[PDB]
Ligand binder design. Structure first.
Ligand SMILES: [Ca+2]
Ligand SMILES: [Zn+2]
Length: 133
């Protein structure tokens, strides 16, 4: 029910993991999912990219590409991990792309939210179905 127009919420560091592994975000997500995939970026994830500066410069530009869908934040100017977790609790129409061990263990509590991570020169499906309370 997630689609085969797939919506993938990007966390703050995911693009950087992609750049480190010589992965093009867009092709990598498309290849991982075998269908049109839409990378998504919340307002406050986008603000961190503005804020953290030099080593997120190339991430910032990539995040401003046409193919990104921007997700407005209906919350106070806050917390990138909490932002994703709150969004995928309301709307189960999302995947989460993160290599962050703590965010993943929070997402694994939420049924139905697949996790993608960068590994071995590809984006892989890290969490397919299983819940860990
Ligand atoms: Ca969309
Ligand atoms: Zn937010």
């Amino acid at each position: 029910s997630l689609g085969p127009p797939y919506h993938v919420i990007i966390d703050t560091n995911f693009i950087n993991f992609c750049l480190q592994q010589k992965i093009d975000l867009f092709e990598g997500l498309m290849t991982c999912l075998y269908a049109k995939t839409i990378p998504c970026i919340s307002d406050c994830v986008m603000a961190e990219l503005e804020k953290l500066g030099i080593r997120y410069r190339i991430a910032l530009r990539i995040a401003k590409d046409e193919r990104f869908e921007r997700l407005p934040c209906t919350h106070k100017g806050t917390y990138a991990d909490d932002c994703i977790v709150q969004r995928v609790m309301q709307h189960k129409c999302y995947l989460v792309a993160t290599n962050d061990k703590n965010l993943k263990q929070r997402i694994r509590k939420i049924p139905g939210i697949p996790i993608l991570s960068v590994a071995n020169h590809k984006i892989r499906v890290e969490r397919l179905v299983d819940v860990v309370d």
